[PDB]
């Protein structure tokens with residue numbers, strides 16, 4: 001799977017909010033482009049002159065994520081974050097020249113991402129009370145990954161002593177995205193666990209934080225809530241469910257070729273962090289069938 005790389009796999013079956021620190025600093029921002037940020041401004045002007053209803057929005061930028069030594073007490077992860085925007089994304093990661101910016105960043109800064117916006121996405125492995133994961137079909141008319149399968153998620157918009165509020169907004173944003181798109185009540189959702197961070201190599205390396213969320217509704221009840229919103233209540237064109245039993249071998253199915261890179265990231269991390277048992281009971285051959 002060349003279109004996704006794992007930046008972080010979390011320990012302990014995934015990390016809760018209270019175990020993560022963020023450092024939000026202008027040191028973690030994108031570097032100005034070699035010939036100046038005028039190239040980003042030109043792409044934005046051209047776009048607005050065709051689609052004048054478009055608007056910019058701020059985004060978090062991922063610089064790096066450092067895990068503590070395994071088994072340690074105290075905070076387990078440090079997220080180094082900057083600020084970027086939808087405009088900077090369209091002028092860098094989504095530019096035809098994005099590969100040239102990656103090479104120039106390696107040359108100038110020893111960092112393939114130094115000249116990239118790299119907005120931080122969020123996604124969820126969302127499990128039902130009857131042990132299915134939730135999948136969404138993307139519209140065939142959108143710009144990125146048209147017609148592909150996705151999981152719930154989005155790209156959160158800003159607003160350890162500014163740090164803890166930023167970690168809170170990240171965890172909050174994955175639940176909000178599930179309520180807005182799947183039409184589920186907030187009180188049916190568990191607090192999220194962070195499983196890891198995955199990179200989309202088809203979008204010049206931009207990263208998504210991938211979370212595990214449990215719902216107290218069955219697959220049938222989740223479907224009812226999604227459909228009862230009507231076509232204008234969701235951006236996706238359909239919902240469907242796969243047994244957690246069958247997610248284990250999803251990369252061997254015909255579904256795998258239809259999954260967008262960030263959803264492949266969510267399923268790989270779910271399989272490594274929530275699946276793949278370590279103990280004698282769940283590891284026994286009748287509960288973990290070989291092959």
Ligand SMILES: Nc1cc(C(=O)O)ccc1NCc1cccnc1
Nearest residue numbers: 059085086089090094119143144155
């Ligand atoms: N690739 C992309 C392009 C356009 C466009 O061409 O307007 C919109 C959305 C896109 N993807 C989703 C996204 C990525 C980064 C930040 N926010 C959202």
